[PDB]
Design a protein around this ligand. Structure first.
Ligand code: KFC
Lengths: 214, 123, 238, 142, 202, 204, 206, 218, 230, 235
């Protein structure tokens, strides 16, 4: 008996100028069966402006989500109702992941949200909490299939052409939909439907995208 | 273990145990320290020559560390305990940081120990 | 009196004087009023007024959980300790069952916590009283705890300095609280709180906090900015 | 209960510890022992209680470790006691243990001043901590 | 991962790459391998990134506490001793971290290397990481004490570039810091391929 | 193994009113001779002589512990410890670390100064005692020592004859052992006197 | 074991030498790292092992010696006492949770009469110390790969009454032999000596 | 003692959960008359695949928690969602202590109209769906249940759900080694959960290709 | 003097005065009655309210300990809650370690032992409440009373509180052999109403509970429309 | 006296030890605090025991963090423990959340340490007595300049202008007038200096008092030197 289990699935975040596009595939599978096609536990809201997305063990990310939620609630109590910022939550996530360094969570996490100026920021972590900021990022089974594609279309390297204008919410959403559609046709452990969270200052909106069922 | 509150406040805002310790200090041998341009002078009362003490000299000013020296007024045994604590602190400092303890760092440590002696139950 | 210096000493008449002294400590705190309606519970807290230029702030009303809050009266440190304990217990419960703690179980837990400190020699009673305002499947709840450990389920109550006037006012309008709306409940609580103020002080936003909990209303605190809707138009008409 | 606590390790309005002074007074009534430190040895001479005709001598082999007033701490250390003899036995055992521990650690005889210091901290500890009475005994170390 | 730091007449030069490779796949190309402990002390990232980040954050917190308690800045000898003591306490806990502490205290510049087993060595030149074998070859050949600040920065940048060119685990953006008596300044941050085209034109 | 890391051998042999205890001089690290002048004998008092064999650090630690215990015993009990009590104390000390065992193997010889009875003991690393009336031996050359003592020992030996037998047995056993040798040191303990001798050996 | 330490005691001095090698699995980090730690005015230890345990052990021993000197009013400890203290520390380490000190020691010192009543050792003292807690007084001792190479050499050439210059030449020969026969590069050897005047750092031999 | 597979499906008005009444000890069919479906509270039911001792202890712990909370305080009985949350937290806590509850549990419940169906692993994984299966029912019965659900997304009637459940039980008896033809179905509805008496499904073994001569290896 | 300041001190006549003071505190509490009816146990307590705005059911003094066992508190209510928690711990220990409901006598003995332990140590004070244990276990209907001194006694009918003697005298008029719980509820409620003084306790409520065959041997409160109005 | 315990209540409901520790505050030196939109000012009377004392060694104003200062009145030996605890908690908050810790949270941590006193040993070693210290914590955070006051009872209170120590009631009487919501930083500094003048038995000199300022725009703490104090006086 092993205390660990990989449930597959993939998440992807892209930080815009005044928004963040978070996305997670809704698919939970066991040893060889398929537990559910409508698992919504991958993406968790911490504050109205901060979200976390985890890949790997489902039970481990449920426990981590509960710990983050209660730490955030304690912070709100101890700071006169002031909600923690995205960077504070990122540092707290890193610290709490490292605290369980000898019995690590089997989670690969991303903390996304807006900065103080309102500009979107993404953070990525290893199992033991090595945080690193970035403007986009993909985690999970299909990360190697979609991350180079985001690298080519966003950084525009090896292109002898003028850089296109910075992408809006709609173009970023379409690009991420293409990335997930391409991933679902080549990776066998991801793809029944993708949940998109578009995080702006004027609230957060949620959308659902259809994928293949095989 | 015995941890009864010994140092407690009085209806006039005074800590009687601290005042009594200070009064015990008031009955101790005098000591003076003088700060100069390049030297520090410490003089102690050196109670007397009893004609029965050992011919070998013993210093009433104690070397806490190679750079730090101490003199006391009050109870001799408590002073010896405090000096042993200060020497152990200097060695622990020079073992955890590779640097010798500054005079003010050791003084702060000793003052903290004395303060904790006034707020610990059963002591 | 040689039977009041210890908590584990019974008076020859069957009294515990240290707990009575803690009750006296509770009776000297700032006045607060709790009112229970059909779907809502409203707490009104009388905070210190500024001395003509100097506004001092001290937190008396605490938010315990999404559905629970409370108002303290007496020793502020004891109230903070009790708030920390209640928040920890609520967090533990919501983690195990994914739902808020029921109010009856919460009141029992507060009573047991109070009783834990009134029988050991190296302990002292909490010199604070609490008004618990919450909501669960069973509807609105309003509790009052005392240093002795007794928890009272109340339709409406008050505690603090000169709170007998608030109680005797509430004893005339409480039987209608099951029909008054939220605004009427707030007005009744405000009138009860104003009945406990001094002669030359009238209720206004600078020195009054209003807490509200309901069926679709999480426990919300109302202070300087948000209290304009309930206190700007308000005056005691005898 | 705290009502009957005698508060042994507490200061008095004059900064003096009454238990220590009472122990000193107790030692004043003990038998007199005099130590003389010469250049070719140290002499201890003490008065022992009047021998009752029914007293018996413990037929100990190695009649140089402990007498009626004088005891051996180590091969290079001796002592004489004045005061509560039963309190003196525990401190003598502690001193022997400390000397043998020092010999275990360094494989050298313990310095006389070091042994005197180590058993003085034991007596001092009971005057600041514990809430019990101190040892009512004075030692003459040679 | 390739990192280097050397002491010269004029202070200390630190240089890093920006590549983190989880085995065969490139995780990121923007990693910050110089960890700014304070405005006067610098640390380096090598080995387990989480271990280094967490423990040098701990070291920075202890340095700030030292400054607050004592009213004066901590020395590099004491700062490196804190990290070495922490690491030695965890020597059997499987830590993976090789860092360099470089600073300018009241006794001039000083540079220490601290591994994951409590070692703490004080020399004038270190290279750490899988690409160090390539840095040393370029670094030992051109190093001399009487180097200019520009010359020392050029030497460090060239050594890091030559490490990234042959080592598959090293790459990204070459970053160069200079530690002087007034603290440290980020001297440069240049892409590795542009460095290749600058050093080998045509 | 750990017991043969340092080398060394000790053997005690019983005379009439006497016993001879002999140890080799070699101290090494598993092949390499660190020193050739390291005897393994220890004198407790005028009646008891014991030797230790095994890991040298464990030998020294156990010898220090035994010295502590015997000094405390002589301080508390105003008398010299006897051989049987000393052997029992060593047995108890070795069995206290039954699962963390010391890597020594003591060889104790003792004689009653008033009676003359000879007591020999040789415990295992966990204290399992062994009290024969002829000889005991421990070390890397234990088998050869056993053979030589079995072939040479007789009950009614004189101190000189017993010493010669012990020396011959020790040298012949060390000749066949690569971890023991470089001469020997012997102690002849009688009722009236104690003699210490150093015995020529091969420098191999 | 990769780094070789040599020590030999003569009539009026003890000379020790320690390789300055520091490596990472095949990479020479530095070749000038002093592994000889001065404990007291007339005492030092040459320690072989990786940097962490060696530095921790030497600093612990030195700090404890300094603390003892403080609590004993500047009374300096004898070489045998310090050697036994180190041996006790090493032996206690091997049965502890944190494990044994992977450090091999050559402890050198010079004993002087602390007072007119002193009647102890007056000549020089040298002690071999294994990491397991072995302690042995030796005329000369060695650690590391080259140790055996030196030892026989010393058995061929060492004399009790060697002079300082002839001892320096002998140590130069030993270091040359280590450089000649050991595949591990020990280029620099960090030679120090203990005499009645204390510790001297000898730069002629390296 | 180990239990076989458990299956469950939500129908338009409640939940059905079927399991065989067998405990095996390795390949030995040890006890064929074991009631494996246990009632929790007045609203829920549970059945575990795997170790029976761990299931017994966990079910006792869960049932004690509900009754004591209802009895000690004047509070409403725990909702099926809350009971399953407590069960999942307890299982995960056992996993983190390296003393896991080596079972895969299917949990059903109904209160005042809302239906709850969920599954939990021995390591803390939890999920909810319209059809749950553990053991070989996850590979055998679950595809058939999903197909039956997707052929009519408006909802299954109780008879339609029972028919496909019996079909899945028949296939499980065909294809699972440690199984017997004796099953119990618990029905969670508005009034409460009702466990049926043990029954059996009719099987077919008379295929023309199953004869002695066609299957013979001459 | 100092002979009555702590429980660890005997008086010159062999008495523990702190326990007597706790019993005096019990004797100043509201009246409670209980009856064992050969087919079940019925307990009835009076609750005095100091406010007219209290929610119905406030300050419950009767609490279920097990399915078949319950405890009524006469005295300091928080101390009774602590005793009830201890009794609930004792009852669930039997159901978890021995897989059997706790017998009424066993539960009463456990409650008495728990209450007695606080009368022997200087660091604690005795409970200021008496416990009425009503059980219907495998040993039949059982009614016990636990004194702050920790002594337990079984009764057919028992009365405690301020109006104790008159309530006991009224209980002496019952038969307890032909008495059934259905009429015993009314009898106890009538006794409590008659013995209570109406000019000192303005706000009073009668709280009645029982465990007999009619409740499937489960300790519950009465239906609301069963006790007399007054 | 040990007639009453340390956890006993007065018949009026007050804890005897806490009320006795409050009277120790009034025996200490005077400390000030002014909150203004431009920043927060802390002032303190040094009251050196002799002219031979180095005045910097008795700092009545201590830096908890680069944005938070604390000035104590009463027993300076006990105040060191509180300030060290506040520093440790602020550094922990910076370590965990990568942001400066709020003034209210720092005061909360200080009071959390303060309340942990008693006599029952049990599992945790408590303090035999409450702190004889009243703290005045000033800082600048996301809510602008904030000033808080700490009591030996463990009760924190946000203030606009609070004074502790011997000259407390006179300072409050001056506070009732001459103070408004929107004073400039210089006006607050002059008010603090004048209030120290009004409640000081000794004569005011640049080295006789201690002044610190946390600026709203800067966000950092600035200890004032004697020449700066003289410049304040020369206005
Ligand atoms: C001073 C120094 C020199 C070379 C170093 N070299 C490597 C390294 O990984 N070399 C590769 C393997 C062999 C050849 C290439 C690693 C080092 N420290 C280190 C880094 C991370 C964790 C722990 C320690 C070094 C430190």
């Amino acid at each position: 008996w092993s205390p660990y289990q990989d449930n597959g699935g993939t998440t992807a975040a892209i930080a815009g100028k005044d928004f963040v596009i978070l996305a997670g595939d809704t698919r939970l599978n066991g040893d060889f069966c398929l537990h559910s096609r409508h698992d919504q536990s991958k993406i968790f809201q911490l504050t109205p402006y901060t979200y976390m997305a985890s890949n790997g063990m489902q039970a481990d990310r449920l426990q981590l989500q509960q710990m983050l939620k209660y730490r955030v609630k304690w912070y709100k109590y101890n700071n006169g109702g002031k909600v923690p910022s995205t960077k504070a939550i990122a540092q707290l996530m890193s610290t709490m992941l490292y605290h369980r360094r000898f019995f690590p969570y089997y989670t690969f996490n991303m903390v996304v949200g807006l900065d103080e100026e309102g500009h979107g920021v993404c953070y990525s972590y290893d199992a033991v909490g090595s945080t690193e900021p970035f403007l986009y990022g993909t985690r999970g089974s299909a990360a190697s299939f979609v991350e180079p594609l985001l690298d080519c279309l966003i950084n525009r390297q090896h292109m002898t052409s003028q850089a296109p204008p910075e992408m809006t919410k709609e173009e970023t959403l379409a690009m991420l939909k293409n990335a997930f559609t391409g991933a679902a046709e080549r990776d066998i452990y991801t793809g029944d439907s993708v949940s998109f969270f578009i995080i702006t200052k004027d609230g957060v909106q949620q959308e659902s995208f259809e994928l293949r069922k095989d | 273990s015995y941890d009864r509150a010994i140092t407690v406040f009085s209806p006039d805002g005074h800590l009687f145990q601290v005042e009594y310790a200070q009064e015990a200090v008031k009955k101790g041998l005098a000591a003076v320290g003088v700060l100069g341009s390049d030297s520090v002078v410490i003089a102690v009362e050196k109670k007397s020559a009893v004609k029965l003490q050992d011919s070998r000299t013993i210093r009433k000013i104690y070397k806490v560390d190679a750079n730090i020296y101490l003199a006391f007024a009050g109870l001799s045994a408590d002073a010896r305990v405090l000096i042993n604590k200060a020497q152990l602190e200097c060695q622990r400092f020079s073992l955890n940081y590779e640097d010798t303890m500054d005079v003010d760092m050791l003084v702060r440590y000793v003052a903290g120990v004395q303060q904790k002696s006034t707020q610990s139950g059963g002591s | 009196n040689e039977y009041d210096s210890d908590i584990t000493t019974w008076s020859p008449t069957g009294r515990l004087f240290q707990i009575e002294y803690a009750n006296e400590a509770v009776n000297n705190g700032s006045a607060t009023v709790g009112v229970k309606g059909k779907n809502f519970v409203v707490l009104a807290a009388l905070k210190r007024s500024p001395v003509a230029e100097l506004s001092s702030y001290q937190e008396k009303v605490f938010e315990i959980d999404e559905h629970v809050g409370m108002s303290i009266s007496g020793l502020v440190a004891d109230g903070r300790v009790l708030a920390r304990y209640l928040r920890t217990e609520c967090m533990n419960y919501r983690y195990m069952y994914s739902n808020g703690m029921p109010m009856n179980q919460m009141a029992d837990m507060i009573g047991e916590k109070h009783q834990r400190h009134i029988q050991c020699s190296g302990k002292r009673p909490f010199g604070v009283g609490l008004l618990l305002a919450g909501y669960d499947r069973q509807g609105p709840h309003l509790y009052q705890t005392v240093p002795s450990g007794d928890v009272y389920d109340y339709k409406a109550t008050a505690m603090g300095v000169r709170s007998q006037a608030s109680r005797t006012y509430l004893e005339r309008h409480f039987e209608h609280f099951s029909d008054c709306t939220l605004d009427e409940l707030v007005t009744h609580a405000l009138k009860a709180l104003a009945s406990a103020t001094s002669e030359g002080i009238e209720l206004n936003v600078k020195n009054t906090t209003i807490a509200i909990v309901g069926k679709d209303t999480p426990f919300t605190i109302f202070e300087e900015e948000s209290a304009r809707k309930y206190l700007d138009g308000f005056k005691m008409r005898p | 209960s705290h009502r009957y606590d005698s508060r042994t390790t507490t200061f008095s309005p004059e900064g003096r510890l009454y238990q220590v002074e009472y122990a000193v007074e107790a030692i004043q009534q003990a038998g007199t022992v005099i130590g003389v430190c010469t250049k070719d040895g140290v002499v201890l001479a003490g008065e022992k209680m009047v021998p009752h005709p029914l007293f018996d001598s413990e037929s100990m082999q190695d009649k140089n470790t402990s007498g009626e007033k004088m005891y051996k701490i180590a091969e290079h250390i001796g002592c004489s006691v004045a005061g509560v003899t039963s309190d003196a036995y525990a401190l003598l055992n502690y001193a022997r243990l400390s000397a043998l521990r020092h010999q275990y650690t360094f494989q050298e005889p313990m310095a006389i001043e070091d042994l005197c210091r180590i058993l003085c901290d034991e007596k001092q500890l009971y005057t600041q901590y514990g809430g019990v009475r101190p040892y009512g005994v004075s030692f003459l170390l040679v | 991962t390739t990192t280097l730091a050397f002491r010269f007449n004029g202070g200390i030069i630190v240089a890093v790459d920006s590549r983190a490779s989880t085995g065969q796949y490139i995780a990121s190309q923007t990693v910050m391998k110089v960890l700014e402990i304070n405005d006067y002390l610098l640390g380096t990232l090598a080995g387990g990134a989480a271990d280094c980040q967490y423990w040098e954050r701990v070291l920075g917190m202890e340095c700030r506490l030292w400054e607050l308690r004592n009213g004066s800045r901590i020395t590099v000898a004491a700062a490196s001793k804190i990290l070495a003591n922490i690491t030695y306490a965890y020597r059997n806990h499987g830590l993976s971290m090789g860092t360099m502490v470089a600073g300018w205290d009241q006794f001039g510049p000083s540079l220490y290397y601290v591994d994951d087993k409590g070692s703490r060595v004080k020399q004038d030149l270190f290279s750490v990481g899988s690409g160090s074998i390539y840095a040393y070859g370029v670094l030992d050949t051109g190093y001399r004490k009487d180097l200019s600040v520009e010359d020392a920065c050029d030497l460090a940048r060239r050594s890091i570039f030559h490490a990234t060119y042959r080592d598959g685990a090293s790459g990204g953006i070459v970053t160069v810091y200079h530690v002087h008596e007034k603290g440290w300044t980020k001297i440069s941050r240049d892409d590795q391929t542009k460095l290749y085209h600058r050093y080998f034109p045509s | 193994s750990i017991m043969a890391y340092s080398g060394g051998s000790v053997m005690a042999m019983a005379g009439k009113e006497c016993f001879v205890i002999i140890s080799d001089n070699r101290l090494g690290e598993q092949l390499k001779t660190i020193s050739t002048e390291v005897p393994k004998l220890h004198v407790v008092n005028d009646s008891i002589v014991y030797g230790l064999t095994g890991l040298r650090t464990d030998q020294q630690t156990f010898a220090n512990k035994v010295q502590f215990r015997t000094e405390m015993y002589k301080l508390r009990e105003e008398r010299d410890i006897t051989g049987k009590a000393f052997a029992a104390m060593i047995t108890s000390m070795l069995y206290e670390a039954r699962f963390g065992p010391w890597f020594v193997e003591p060889v104790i010889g003792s004689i009653d100064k008033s009676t003359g009875e000879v007591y020999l003991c040789a415990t295992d690393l966990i204290g399992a005692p062994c009290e024969p009336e002829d000889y005991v031996c421990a070390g890397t050359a234990a088998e050869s020592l056993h053979g030589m003592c079995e072939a040479l020992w007789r009950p009614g030996m004189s101190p000189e004859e017993l010493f010669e037998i012990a020396a011959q047995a020790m040298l012949s056993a060390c000749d066949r052992d690569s971890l023991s040798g470089y001469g020997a040191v012997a102690m002849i303990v009688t009722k009236d006197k104690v003699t210490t001798r150093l015995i020529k050996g091969r420098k191999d | 074991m990769a780094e070789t330490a040599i020590a030999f005691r003569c009539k009026d001095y003890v000379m020790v030498a320690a390789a300055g090698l520091n490596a990472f699995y095949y990479i020479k980090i530095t070749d000038a790292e002093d592994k000889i730690t001065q404990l007291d005015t007339h005492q030092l230890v040459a320690c072989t092992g990786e940097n962490g345990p060696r530095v921790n052990f030497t600093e612990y021993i030195k700090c404890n010696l300094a603390l003892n000197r403080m609590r004993q009013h500047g009374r300096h400890s004898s070489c045998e006492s310090t050697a036994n203290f180190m041996r006790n520390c090493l032996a206690s380490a091997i049965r502890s949770r944190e494990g044994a000190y992977q450090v091999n020691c050559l402890f050198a010192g010079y004993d002087t009469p602390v007072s007119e009543d002193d009647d102890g050792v007056v000549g020089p003292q040298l002690f071999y110390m294994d990491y397991l807690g072995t302690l042995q007084a030796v005329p000369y001792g060695c650690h590391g790969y080259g140790a055996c190479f030196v030892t026989a050499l010393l058995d061929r050439l060492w004399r009790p009454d060697l002079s300082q210059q002839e001892g320096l030449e002998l140590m130069q020969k030993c270091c040359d032999e280590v450089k000649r026969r050991v595949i591990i590069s020990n280029s620099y050897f960090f030679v120090k000596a203990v005499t009645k005047n204390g510790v001297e750092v000898i730069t002629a031999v390296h | 003692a180990s239990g076989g597979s458990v299956i469950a499906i939500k129908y338009k008005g409640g939940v059905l959960m079927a399991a065989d009444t067998l405990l095996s000890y390795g390949s030995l069919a040890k006890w064929p008359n074991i009631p494996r479906i246990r009632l929790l509270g007045s609203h829920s039911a549970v059945c575990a695949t795997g170790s029976y001792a761990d299931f017994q202890m966990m079910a006792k712990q869960v049932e004690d928690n509900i009754e004591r909370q209802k009895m000690y305080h004047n509070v409403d009985e725990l909702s099926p969602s809350e009971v399953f949350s407590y069960l999942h937290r307890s299982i995960y806590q056992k996993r983190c202590d390296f003393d896991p509850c080596l079972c895969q549990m299917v949990f059903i419940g109904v209160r005042d109209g809302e239906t709850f169906l969920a599954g939990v692993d021995d390591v803390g994984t939890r999920w909810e769906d319209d059809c749950i299966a553990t053991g070989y029912g996850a590979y055998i019965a679950l595809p058939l249940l999903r197909q039956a659900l997707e052929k009519n997304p408006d909802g299954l009637s109780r008879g339609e759900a029972m028919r496909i459940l019996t079909d899945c039980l028949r296939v499980l008896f065909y294809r699972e080694c440690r199984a017997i033809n004796k099953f119990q179905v618990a029905d969670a509805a508005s009034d409460g959960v009702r466990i049926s008496e043990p029954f059996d499904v009719e099987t077919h073994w008379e295929y023309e290709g199953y004869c002695f001569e066609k299957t013979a290896i001459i | 003097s100092g002979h009555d300041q702590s429980t660890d001190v005997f008086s010159a006549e062999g008495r523990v005065f702190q326990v007597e003071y706790a019993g005096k505190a019990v004797d100043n509490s509201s009246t409670a009655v209980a009856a064992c009816c050969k087919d079940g146990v019925v307990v009835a307590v009076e609750k005095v309210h100091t406010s007219r705005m209290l929610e119905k059911g406030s300050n419950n003094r009767i609490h279920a300990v097990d399915r078949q066992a319950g405890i009524c508190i006469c005295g300091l209510l928080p101390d009774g809650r602590a005793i009830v928690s201890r009794a609930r711990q004792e009852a669930e220990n039997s159901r978890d370690i021995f897989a059997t409901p706790i017998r009424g006598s066993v539960l009463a003995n456990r409650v008495g032992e728990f209450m007695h332990a606080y009368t022997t140590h200087f660091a604690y004070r005795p409970f200021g409440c008496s416990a009425i244990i009503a059980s219907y276990a495998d040993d039949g209907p059982q009614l016990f009373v636990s004194d702050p001194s920790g002594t337990v006694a079984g009764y057919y009918g028992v009365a405690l509180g301020k109006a104790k003697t008159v309530a006991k005298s009224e209980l002496e008029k019952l038969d307890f052999s032909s008495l059934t719980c259905d009429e015993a509820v009314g009898k106890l409620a009538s006794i409590l109403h008659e013995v209570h003084d109406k000019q000192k306790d303005k706000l009073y409520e009668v709280e009645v509970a029982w465990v007999c065959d009619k409740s499937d041997r489960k300790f519950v409160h009465v239906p609301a429309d069963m006790v007399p109005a007054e | 006296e040990y007639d009453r315990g340390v956890n006993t209540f007065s018949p009026e409901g007050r804890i005897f030890q806490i009320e006795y520790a409050v009277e120790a505050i009034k025996l200490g030196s005077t400390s000030l605090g002014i909150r203004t939109p431009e920043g927060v000012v802390l002032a303190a009377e040094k009251r050196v025991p002799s002219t031979l004392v180095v005045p910097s060694s008795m700092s009545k104003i201590m830096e908890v963090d680069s944005h938070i200062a604390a000035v104590m009145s009463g027993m300076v030996a006990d105040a060191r423990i509180l300030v060290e605890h506040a520093r440790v908690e602020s550094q922990n908050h910076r370590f965990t959340y990568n942001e400066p810790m709020s003034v209210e949270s720092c005061t909360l941590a200080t009071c959390d340490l303060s309340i942990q006193f008693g006599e029952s040993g049990g599992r945790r070693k408590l303090m035999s007595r409450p702190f004889g210290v009243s703290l005045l914590i000033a800082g600048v955070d996301e809510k602008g300049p904030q000033l808080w006051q700490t009591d030996p009872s463990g009760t924190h209170t946000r203030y606009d202008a609070q004074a502790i120590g011997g000259g407390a009631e006179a300072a409050q009487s001056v506070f009732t007038e001459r103070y408004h919501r929107n004073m400039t930083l210089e006006e607050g500094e002059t008010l603090a200096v004048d209030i120290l003048k009004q409640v000081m038995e000794d004569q005011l000199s640049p080295e006789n008092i201690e002044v610190a300022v946390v600026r709203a725009d800067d966000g950092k703490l600035h200890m004032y030197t004697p020449t700066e104090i003289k410049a304040i006086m020369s206005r």
